Amino acid sequence: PMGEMDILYQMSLNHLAVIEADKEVLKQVGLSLAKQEEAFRELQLILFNHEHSYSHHGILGSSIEILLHWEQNNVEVMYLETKVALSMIDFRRWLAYTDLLLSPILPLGTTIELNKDLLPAALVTSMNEIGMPFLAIVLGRRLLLGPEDREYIDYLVSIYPYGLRADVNPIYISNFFIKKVLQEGYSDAIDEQYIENQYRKDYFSRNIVSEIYNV
Amino acid sequence: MGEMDILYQMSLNHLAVIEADKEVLKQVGLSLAKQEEAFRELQLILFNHEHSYSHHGILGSSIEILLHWEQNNVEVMYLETKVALSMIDFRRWLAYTDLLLSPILPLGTTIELNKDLLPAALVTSMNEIGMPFLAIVLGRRLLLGPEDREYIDYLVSIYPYGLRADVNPIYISNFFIKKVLQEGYSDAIDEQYIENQYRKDYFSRNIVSEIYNV
Numbered sequence A: 001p002m003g004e005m006d007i008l009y010q011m012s013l014n015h016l017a018v019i020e021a022d023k024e025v026l027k028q029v030g031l032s033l034a035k036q037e038e039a040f041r042e043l044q045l046i047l048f049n050h051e052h053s054y055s056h057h058g059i060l061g062s063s064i065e066i067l068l069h070w071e072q073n074n075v076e077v078m079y080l081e082t083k084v085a086l087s088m089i090d091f092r093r094w095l096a097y098t099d100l101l102l103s104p105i106l107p108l109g110t111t112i113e114l115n116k117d118l119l120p121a122a123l124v125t126s127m128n129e130i131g132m133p134f135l136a137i138v139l140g141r142r143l144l145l146g147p148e149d150r151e152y153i154d155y156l157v158s159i160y161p162y163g164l165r166a167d168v169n170p171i172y173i174s175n176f177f178i179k180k181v182l183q184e185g186y187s188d189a190i191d192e193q194y195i196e197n198q199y200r201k202d203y204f205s206r207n208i209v210s211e212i213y214n215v
Numbered sequence B: 001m002g003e004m005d006i007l008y009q010m011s012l013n014h015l016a017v018i019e020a021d022k023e024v025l026k027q028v029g030l031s032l033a034k035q036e037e038a039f040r041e042l043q044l045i046l047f048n049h050e051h052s053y054s055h056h057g058i059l060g061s062s063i064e065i066l067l068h069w070e071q072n073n074v075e076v077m078y079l080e081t082k083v084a085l086s087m088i089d090f091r092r093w094l095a096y097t098d099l100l101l102s103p104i105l106p107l108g109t110t111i112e113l114n115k116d117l118l119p120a121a122l123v124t125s126m127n128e129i130g131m132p133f134l135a136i137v138l139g140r141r142l143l144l145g146p147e148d149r150e151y152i153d154y155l156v157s158i159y160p161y162g163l164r165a166d167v168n169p170i171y172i173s174n175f176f177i178k179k180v181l182q183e184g185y186s187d188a189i190d191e192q193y194i195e196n197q198y199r200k201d202y203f204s205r206n207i208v209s210e211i212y213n214v
Protein backbone atom coordinates (compact mmCIF):
# COMPACT_ATOMS: atom_id res chain seq x y z
CA PRO A 1 0.00 0.00 0.00
CA MET A 2 1.13 3.54 -0.79
CA GLY A 3 2.38 5.32 2.32
CA GLU A 4 4.00 8.50 3.63
CA MET A 5 7.49 7.43 2.51
CA ASP A 6 6.29 7.37 -1.10
CA ILE A 7 5.29 11.03 -0.72
CA LEU A 8 8.67 12.01 0.74
CA TYR A 9 10.35 10.03 -2.06
CA GLN A 10 8.46 11.98 -4.73
CA MET A 11 9.53 15.19 -2.99
CA SER A 12 13.15 14.04 -3.20
CA LEU A 13 12.73 13.24 -6.90
CA ASN A 14 11.45 16.80 -7.42
CA HIS A 15 14.89 18.09 -6.40
CA LEU A 16 16.42 16.41 -9.47
CA ALA A 17 16.75 18.65 -12.54
CA VAL A 18 15.18 16.09 -14.87
CA ILE A 19 12.01 15.51 -16.89
CA GLU A 20 8.83 14.04 -15.40
CA ALA A 21 9.08 11.08 -17.78
CA ASP A 22 12.60 10.49 -16.44
CA LYS A 23 11.52 11.03 -12.81
CA GLU A 24 9.06 8.18 -13.34
CA VAL A 25 11.64 5.58 -14.33
CA LEU A 26 14.03 6.69 -11.57
CA LYS A 27 11.12 6.17 -9.18
CA GLN A 28 10.66 2.63 -10.50
CA VAL A 29 14.39 1.88 -10.44
CA GLY A 30 14.61 3.08 -6.84
CA LEU A 31 11.62 1.04 -5.68
CA SER A 32 13.14 -2.00 -7.40
CA LEU A 33 16.51 -1.46 -5.73
CA ALA A 34 14.80 -1.02 -2.36
CA LYS A 35 12.96 -4.35 -2.68
CA GLN A 36 16.07 -6.30 -3.77
CA GLU A 37 18.55 -5.89 -0.92
CA GLU A 38 21.40 -7.79 -2.57
CA ALA A 39 20.98 -5.79 -5.78
CA PHE A 40 21.16 -2.47 -3.93
CA ARG A 41 24.23 -3.54 -1.95
CA GLU A 42 26.00 -4.42 -5.21
CA LEU A 43 25.21 -0.95 -6.60
CA GLN A 44 26.27 0.73 -3.34
CA LEU A 45 29.63 -1.02 -3.51
CA ILE A 46 30.07 0.01 -7.16
CA LEU A 47 29.44 3.65 -6.29
CA PHE A 48 31.78 3.43 -3.29
CA ASN A 49 34.66 1.86 -5.24
CA HIS A 50 34.16 4.29 -8.17
CA GLU A 51 33.36 1.48 -10.58
CA HIS A 52 31.90 2.48 -13.94
CA SER A 53 29.37 -0.28 -14.73
CA TYR A 54 26.43 -1.93 -12.97
CA SER A 55 24.19 -4.69 -14.32
CA HIS A 56 21.72 -6.70 -12.25
CA HIS A 57 18.66 -8.86 -12.95
CA GLY A 58 17.21 -10.35 -9.78
CA ILE A 59 14.20 -12.60 -9.25
CA LEU A 60 11.88 -9.61 -8.85
CA GLY A 61 11.99 -6.82 -11.43
CA SER A 62 13.56 -6.01 -14.77
CA SER A 63 17.24 -5.71 -15.55
CA ILE A 64 18.89 -2.52 -14.29
CA GLU A 65 21.95 -1.21 -16.13
CA ILE A 66 23.88 1.85 -14.96
CA LEU A 67 27.00 3.35 -16.52
CA LEU A 68 28.89 5.64 -14.12
CA HIS A 69 30.91 8.07 -16.26
CA TRP A 70 33.24 9.33 -13.54
CA GLU A 71 35.47 11.35 -15.87
CA GLN A 72 32.41 13.22 -17.21
CA ASN A 73 30.73 13.52 -13.77
CA ASN A 74 27.46 12.04 -15.05
CA VAL A 75 25.56 8.76 -15.16
CA GLU A 76 23.29 6.79 -17.49
CA VAL A 77 20.43 4.68 -16.11
CA MET A 78 18.45 2.24 -18.25
CA TYR A 79 15.23 0.49 -17.25
CA LEU A 80 12.61 -0.99 -19.61
CA GLU A 81 14.30 0.30 -22.77
CA THR A 82 14.26 3.85 -21.34
CA LYS A 83 17.55 5.69 -20.81
CA VAL A 84 18.05 8.55 -18.33
CA ALA A 85 21.01 10.92 -18.05
CA LEU A 86 21.88 12.28 -14.60
CA SER A 87 24.69 14.39 -13.26
CA MET A 88 26.83 12.57 -10.72
CA ILE A 89 25.59 14.84 -7.92
CA ASP A 90 21.95 14.07 -8.82
CA PHE A 91 22.73 10.35 -9.04
CA ARG A 92 24.21 10.33 -5.53
CA ARG A 93 21.30 12.33 -4.12
CA TRP A 94 18.75 10.07 -5.83
CA LEU A 95 20.23 6.89 -4.38
CA ALA A 96 20.74 8.59 -1.01
CA TYR A 97 17.05 9.35 -0.56
CA THR A 98 16.11 6.00 -2.09
CA ASP A 99 18.22 4.39 0.64
CA LEU A 100 17.00 6.73 3.39
CA LEU A 101 13.28 6.42 2.71
CA LEU A 102 12.81 2.95 1.19
CA SER A 103 15.58 0.56 2.27
CA PRO A 104 14.57 -1.92 5.00
CA ILE A 105 16.19 -1.52 8.42
CA LEU A 106 17.08 -4.65 10.36
CA PRO A 107 15.78 -5.24 13.91
CA LEU A 108 18.08 -4.77 16.87
CA GLY A 109 19.79 -8.01 17.86
CA THR A 110 19.78 -9.36 14.30
CA THR A 111 22.60 -11.80 13.57
CA ILE A 112 24.27 -11.18 10.20
CA GLU A 113 27.20 -12.57 8.24
CA LEU A 114 29.66 -9.97 6.98
CA ASN A 115 31.41 -10.15 3.62
CA LYS A 116 35.02 -10.95 4.52
CA ASP A 117 36.19 -9.52 1.17
CA LEU A 118 35.02 -6.04 2.25
CA LEU A 119 36.39 -6.03 5.80
CA PRO A 120 40.00 -4.97 6.50
CA ALA A 121 42.41 -7.89 6.43
CA ALA A 122 43.68 -7.15 9.94
CA LEU A 123 40.14 -7.58 11.29
CA VAL A 124 39.51 -10.81 9.37
CA THR A 125 42.82 -12.33 10.48
CA SER A 126 42.56 -11.43 14.18
CA MET A 127 38.82 -11.90 14.85
CA ASN A 128 38.04 -14.72 12.39
CA GLU A 129 39.52 -17.89 10.95
CA ILE A 130 39.17 -19.77 7.68
CA GLY A 131 35.99 -21.82 7.37
CA MET A 132 34.08 -19.79 9.97
CA PRO A 133 31.55 -17.21 8.75
CA PHE A 134 32.21 -13.71 10.07
CA LEU A 135 29.08 -13.27 12.19
CA ALA A 136 27.98 -10.05 13.88
CA ILE A 137 25.07 -8.67 15.94
CA VAL A 138 23.27 -5.40 15.16
CA LEU A 139 23.71 -3.12 18.19
CA GLY A 140 22.68 0.26 16.77
CA ARG A 141 21.17 1.59 13.57
CA ARG A 142 21.61 4.73 11.44
CA LEU A 143 23.97 6.41 13.88
CA LEU A 144 24.67 10.12 13.50
CA LEU A 145 28.23 11.18 12.67
CA GLY A 146 30.13 13.90 14.48
CA PRO A 147 28.76 16.99 16.21
CA GLU A 148 26.94 18.34 13.13
CA ASP A 149 24.88 15.15 12.52
CA ARG A 150 24.88 15.65 8.75
CA GLU A 151 25.33 11.96 7.84
CA TYR A 152 24.58 8.55 9.34
CA ILE A 153 26.25 5.14 9.28
CA ASP A 154 23.96 2.16 8.69
CA TYR A 155 24.92 -0.11 11.58
CA LEU A 156 27.04 -0.56 14.68
CA VAL A 157 27.76 -4.24 15.25
CA SER A 158 29.55 -6.52 17.71
CA ILE A 159 31.55 -9.56 16.62
CA TYR A 160 29.93 -12.90 17.44
CA PRO A 161 30.27 -14.62 19.89
CA TYR A 162 32.31 -12.06 21.86
CA GLY A 163 29.74 -9.28 21.92
CA LEU A 164 30.56 -5.99 23.59
CA ARG A 165 33.82 -6.29 25.56
CA ALA A 166 36.45 -4.00 27.03
CA ASP A 167 38.94 -5.60 24.63
CA VAL A 168 36.52 -6.10 21.72
CA ASN A 169 35.32 -2.75 20.35
CA PRO A 170 32.22 -2.65 18.10
CA ILE A 171 32.41 -2.02 14.36
CA TYR A 172 30.66 0.62 12.27
CA ILE A 173 29.58 -0.87 8.93
CA SER A 174 27.65 0.25 5.89
CA ASN A 175 24.80 -1.89 4.61
CA PHE A 176 26.85 -3.25 1.70
CA PHE A 177 29.10 -5.06 4.22
CA ILE A 178 26.30 -7.56 4.87
CA LYS A 179 26.60 -10.91 3.09
CA LYS A 180 23.66 -12.71 4.72
CA VAL A 181 21.01 -12.31 7.41
CA LEU A 182 20.97 -15.38 9.66
CA GLN A 183 18.26 -14.52 12.22
CA GLU A 184 16.32 -11.28 12.68
CA GLY A 185 15.96 -9.76 16.12
CA TYR A 186 12.71 -8.84 17.81
CA SER A 187 10.56 -6.08 16.33
CA ASP A 188 7.01 -4.86 16.90
CA ALA A 189 4.87 -1.80 16.17
CA ILE A 190 6.89 0.29 18.63
CA ASP A 191 10.08 -0.30 16.63
CA GLU A 192 8.36 0.32 13.28
CA GLN A 193 6.91 3.61 14.54
CA TYR A 194 10.29 4.72 15.92
CA ILE A 195 12.11 3.80 12.68
CA GLU A 196 9.60 5.70 10.56
CA ASN A 197 9.61 8.84 12.71
CA GLN A 198 13.33 9.13 13.53
CA TYR A 199 15.33 7.25 10.90
CA ARG A 200 13.21 8.36 7.93
CA LYS A 201 10.95 11.35 8.66
CA ASP A 202 13.25 13.34 10.96
CA TYR A 203 16.39 12.57 8.94
CA PHE A 204 14.61 13.56 5.72
CA SER A 205 13.62 16.90 7.29
CA ARG A 206 17.27 17.60 8.16
CA ASN A 207 18.77 16.24 4.89
CA ILE A 208 20.60 13.46 6.74
CA VAL A 209 21.61 10.60 4.42
CA SER A 210 24.03 7.70 4.54
CA GLU A 211 27.73 8.60 4.53
CA ILE A 212 28.56 6.40 1.52
CA TYR A 213 26.86 8.79 -0.90
CA ASN A 214 28.75 12.05 -0.17
CA VAL A 215 26.19 14.36 -1.77
CA MET B 1 28.43 -32.16 30.87
CA GLY B 2 29.99 -34.54 33.37
CA GLU B 3 32.84 -32.03 33.20
CA MET B 4 30.56 -29.25 34.45
CA ASP B 5 29.15 -31.52 37.15
CA ILE B 6 32.65 -32.27 38.43
CA LEU B 7 33.55 -28.58 38.40
CA TYR B 8 30.44 -27.92 40.47
CA GLN B 9 31.45 -30.71 42.85
CA MET B 10 34.90 -29.13 43.19
CA SER B 11 33.46 -25.67 43.88
CA LEU B 12 31.60 -27.10 46.89
CA ASN B 13 35.01 -27.79 48.48
CA HIS B 14 35.31 -24.01 48.94
CA LEU B 15 32.64 -24.39 51.65
CA ALA B 16 33.36 -25.25 55.28
CA VAL B 17 30.77 -28.01 55.60
CA ILE B 18 30.62 -31.76 56.06
CA GLU B 19 30.54 -34.02 53.02
CA ALA B 20 26.95 -35.12 53.67
CA ASP B 21 25.98 -31.44 53.53
CA LYS B 22 27.78 -30.91 50.22
CA GLU B 23 25.68 -33.63 48.58
CA VAL B 24 22.48 -31.91 49.73
CA LEU B 25 23.70 -28.51 48.52
CA LYS B 26 24.65 -30.07 45.17
CA GLN B 27 21.10 -31.36 44.68
CA VAL B 28 19.47 -28.07 45.67
CA GLY B 29 21.89 -26.11 43.49
CA LEU B 30 21.11 -28.20 40.42
CA SER B 31 17.42 -27.75 41.27
CA LEU B 32 17.77 -23.95 41.42
CA ALA B 33 19.88 -23.78 38.26
CA LYS B 34 17.27 -25.75 36.30
CA GLN B 35 14.45 -23.36 37.34
CA GLU B 36 15.52 -19.89 36.24
CA GLU B 37 12.52 -18.02 37.66
CA ALA B 38 12.90 -19.72 41.05
CA PHE B 39 16.63 -18.94 41.13
CA ARG B 40 15.93 -15.32 40.18
CA GLU B 41 13.46 -15.14 43.09
CA LEU B 42 16.08 -16.37 45.56
CA GLN B 43 18.66 -13.93 44.19
CA LEU B 44 16.24 -11.04 44.70
CA ILE B 45 15.49 -12.27 48.24
CA LEU B 46 19.23 -12.22 48.95
CA PHE B 47 19.53 -8.77 47.34
CA ASN B 48 16.58 -7.42 49.36
CA HIS B 49 17.88 -8.91 52.64
CA GLU B 50 14.62 -10.83 52.96
CA HIS B 51 14.14 -13.71 55.35
CA SER B 52 12.34 -16.67 53.76
CA TYR B 53 12.42 -18.53 50.45
CA SER B 54 10.34 -21.53 49.43
CA HIS B 55 9.91 -23.30 46.11
CA HIS B 56 7.71 -26.28 45.28
CA GLY B 57 8.19 -26.46 41.49
CA ILE B 58 10.31 -29.61 41.78
CA LEU B 59 8.32 -32.79 41.21
CA GLY B 60 9.63 -34.53 44.31
CA SER B 61 10.15 -32.27 47.32
CA SER B 62 9.88 -28.60 48.22
CA ILE B 63 12.88 -26.44 49.13
CA GLU B 64 12.85 -23.95 52.01
CA ILE B 65 15.67 -21.52 52.79
CA LEU B 66 15.75 -19.35 55.91
CA LEU B 67 18.16 -16.42 56.09
CA HIS B 68 19.05 -15.62 59.72
CA TRP B 69 20.68 -12.25 59.15
CA GLU B 70 21.37 -11.51 62.81
CA GLN B 71 22.95 -14.94 63.40
CA ASN B 72 24.87 -14.52 60.11
CA ASN B 73 23.91 -18.01 58.96
CA VAL B 74 21.39 -19.77 56.70
CA GLU B 75 19.24 -22.92 56.92
CA VAL B 76 18.63 -24.95 53.75
CA MET B 77 15.89 -27.57 54.09
CA TYR B 78 15.51 -30.30 51.47
CA LEU B 79 13.88 -33.75 51.53
CA GLU B 80 13.49 -33.47 55.32
CA THR B 81 17.23 -32.73 55.63
CA LYS B 82 18.73 -29.53 57.03
CA VAL B 83 22.07 -27.90 56.20
CA ALA B 84 23.33 -24.95 58.24
CA LEU B 85 25.60 -22.56 56.34
CA SER B 86 27.33 -19.36 57.33
CA MET B 87 26.15 -16.35 55.35
CA ILE B 88 29.53 -16.21 53.59
CA ASP B 89 29.34 -19.87 52.53
CA PHE B 90 25.73 -19.43 51.42
CA ARG B 91 26.80 -16.59 49.12
CA ARG B 92 29.74 -18.64 47.85
CA TRP B 93 27.55 -21.69 47.19
CA LEU B 94 25.06 -19.65 45.16
CA ALA B 95 27.85 -17.80 43.33
CA TYR B 96 29.45 -20.99 42.02
CA THR B 97 26.03 -22.48 41.27
CA ASP B 98 25.29 -19.35 39.21
CA LEU B 99 28.71 -19.34 37.53
CA LEU B 100 28.79 -22.99 36.51
CA LEU B 101 25.15 -24.01 36.01
CA SER B 102 22.96 -20.99 35.21
CA PRO B 103 21.92 -20.59 31.55
CA ILE B 104 23.44 -17.70 29.61
CA LEU B 105 21.31 -15.94 27.01
CA PRO B 106 22.41 -15.51 23.39
CA LEU B 107 23.64 -12.16 22.18
CA GLY B 108 20.86 -10.07 20.67
CA THR B 109 18.18 -11.59 22.91
CA THR B 110 15.27 -9.26 23.64
CA ILE B 111 14.18 -9.22 27.29
CA GLU B 112 11.66 -7.42 29.48
CA LEU B 113 13.08 -5.89 32.67
CA ASN B 114 11.50 -5.44 36.11
CA LYS B 115 10.79 -1.71 36.32
CA ASP B 116 10.84 -1.79 40.14
CA LEU B 117 14.56 -2.69 40.07
CA LEU B 118 15.46 0.20 37.74
CA PRO B 119 16.03 3.88 38.53
CA ALA B 120 12.69 5.69 38.60
CA ALA B 121 13.76 8.40 36.15
CA LEU B 122 14.88 5.74 33.66
CA VAL B 123 11.45 4.06 33.46
CA THR B 124 9.37 7.25 33.34
CA SER B 125 9.18 7.47 29.55
CA MET B 126 8.07 3.86 29.22
CA ASN B 127 5.41 4.34 31.91
CA GLU B 128 4.19 7.47 30.15
CA ILE B 129 3.04 5.43 27.13
CA GLY B 130 2.19 2.25 29.05
CA MET B 131 4.90 0.17 27.41
CA PRO B 132 7.12 -2.48 29.03
CA PHE B 133 10.82 -1.88 29.54
CA LEU B 134 12.41 -3.89 26.73
CA ALA B 135 16.15 -4.33 26.27
CA ILE B 136 18.64 -6.14 24.02
CA VAL B 137 21.56 -8.21 25.32
CA LEU B 138 24.76 -6.57 24.01
CA GLY B 139 27.37 -8.21 26.26
CA ARG B 140 27.50 -11.03 28.77
CA ARG B 141 29.33 -11.69 32.06
CA LEU B 142 31.41 -8.55 31.70
CA LEU B 143 34.41 -7.97 33.94
CA LEU B 144 34.06 -5.22 36.56
CA GLY B 145 37.02 -2.84 36.60
CA PRO B 146 39.55 -2.04 37.81
CA GLU B 147 40.19 -5.30 39.69
CA ASP B 148 38.31 -7.50 37.18
CA ARG B 149 37.58 -9.91 40.04
CA GLU B 150 33.79 -10.17 39.58
CA TYR B 151 31.41 -10.00 36.62
CA ILE B 152 28.10 -8.37 35.74
CA ASP B 153 25.51 -10.63 34.12
CA TYR B 154 24.48 -8.48 31.16
CA LEU B 155 25.04 -5.18 29.39
CA VAL B 156 21.88 -4.14 27.56
CA SER B 157 20.59 -1.39 25.27
CA ILE B 158 17.15 0.17 25.62
CA TYR B 159 14.67 -0.94 22.94
CA PRO B 160 13.99 0.40 20.34
CA TYR B 161 16.76 3.04 20.56
CA GLY B 162 19.64 0.54 20.60
CA LEU B 163 23.25 1.47 21.29
CA ARG B 164 23.86 5.21 20.75
CA ALA B 165 25.80 8.26 21.87
CA ASP B 166 22.70 9.92 23.35
CA VAL B 167 21.65 6.69 25.15
CA ASN B 168 24.25 4.75 27.14
CA PRO B 169 23.83 1.01 27.76
CA ILE B 170 22.75 -0.33 31.14
CA TYR B 171 24.39 -2.99 33.30
CA ILE B 172 21.86 -5.39 34.84
CA SER B 173 21.92 -8.46 37.04
CA ASN B 174 20.12 -11.61 35.91
CA PHE B 175 17.38 -11.06 38.50
CA PHE B 176 16.31 -7.85 36.70
CA ILE B 177 14.87 -10.02 33.92
CA LYS B 178 11.09 -10.38 33.99
CA LYS B 179 10.69 -12.31 30.71
CA VAL B 180 12.60 -13.40 27.61
CA LEU B 181 10.74 -12.28 24.49
CA GLN B 182 12.97 -13.71 21.75
CA GLU B 183 16.37 -15.37 22.02
CA GLY B 184 19.17 -14.27 19.73
CA TYR B 185 21.21 -16.58 17.52
CA SER B 186 23.45 -19.19 19.14
CA ASP B 187 25.28 -22.26 17.81
CA ALA B 188 28.14 -24.55 18.82
CA ILE B 189 30.72 -21.76 18.48
CA ASP B 190 28.83 -19.74 21.10
CA GLU B 191 28.35 -22.73 23.40
CA GLN B 192 32.06 -23.58 23.34
CA TYR B 193 33.05 -19.95 23.91
CA ILE B 194 30.64 -19.55 26.84
CA GLU B 195 31.80 -22.74 28.53
CA ASN B 196 35.51 -22.06 28.04
CA GLN B 197 35.50 -18.33 28.86
CA TYR B 198 32.50 -17.61 31.11
CA ARG B 199 32.51 -20.85 33.15
CA LYS B 200 35.82 -22.75 33.05
CA ASP B 201 38.13 -19.73 32.83
CA TYR B 202 36.22 -17.64 35.37
CA PHE B 203 36.14 -20.60 37.78
CA SER B 204 39.93 -21.03 37.69
CA ARG B 205 40.26 -17.29 38.42
CA ASN B 206 37.55 -17.11 41.14
CA ILE B 207 35.43 -14.63 39.17
CA VAL B 208 31.75 -14.72 40.19
CA SER B 209 28.69 -12.50 39.84
CA GLU B 210 28.92 -9.21 41.74
CA ILE B 211 25.54 -9.74 43.41
CA TYR B 212 27.00 -12.31 45.81
CA ASN B 213 29.75 -10.02 47.16
CA VAL B 214 32.02 -12.92 48.12
Ligand SMILES: [Cl-]
Pocket (backbone or CB within 6 Å): A142, A143, A144, B164, B165, B166
Ligand atom coordinates in the same frame (compact mmCIF):
# COMPACT_ATOMS: atom_id res chain seq x y z
CL1 LIG C 1 23.45 8.53 17.32
Ligand SMILES: [Cl-]
Pocket (backbone or CB within 6 Å): A145, A146, A147, A148, A149
Ligand atom coordinates in the same frame (compact mmCIF):
# COMPACT_ATOMS: atom_id res chain seq x y z
CL1 LIG D 1 31.18 16.66 11.10
Ligand SMILES: [Cl-]
Pocket (backbone or CB within 6 Å): A157, A158, A159, A162, A163, A164, A165, A168, A169, A170, A171
Ligand atom coordinates in the same frame (compact mmCIF):
# COMPACT_ATOMS: atom_id res chain seq x y z
CL1 LIG E 1 32.71 -6.12 18.81
Ligand SMILES: [Cl-]
Pocket (backbone or CB within 6 Å): B156, B157, B158, B161, B162, B163, B164, B167, B168, B169, B170
Ligand atom coordinates in the same frame (compact mmCIF):
# COMPACT_ATOMS: atom_id res chain seq x y z
CL1 LIG F 1 21.05 2.21 25.24
